């Protein structure tokens, strides 16, 4: 079933108590945090002796 990714994550927030207004008012902040985490994943997998 096709569904927009913002609305998908908004419906994924209604599983832990958080409503959709949070995601719909801080969509840019959530996107920036997700991109920063994805970017830091490679940096923290770079050396990682274990």
């Amino acid at each position: 079933l096709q569904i927009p990714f913002p609305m998908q994550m908004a419906y994924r927030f209604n599983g832990i108590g958080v409503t959709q207004n949070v995601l719909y008012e801080n969509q840019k902040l959530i996107a920036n945090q997700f991109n920063s985490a994805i970017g830091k994943i490679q940096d923290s997998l770079s050396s990682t002796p274990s």
Partner: protein
């Protein structure tokens, strides 16, 4: 507890497991914030029952 769909000329609200069109009232929606911070806003009307049923 639904999703806003539109058959081309009128918007409705349906549960996301089965198509059941219902009018957008003040019972299946909650107000939070203004129409500037949200990205993807659409102009429409929210039919409330109070004002119609008050007319007598």
């Amino acid at each position: 507890e639904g999703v806003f769909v539109s058959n081309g000329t009128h918007w409705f609200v349906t549960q996301r497991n089965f198509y059941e069109p219902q009018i957008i009232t003040t019972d299946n929606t909650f107000v939070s914030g203004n129409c500037d911070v949200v990205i993807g806003i659409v102009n429409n009307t929210v039919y409330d029952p109070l004002q119609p049923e008050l007319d007598s």
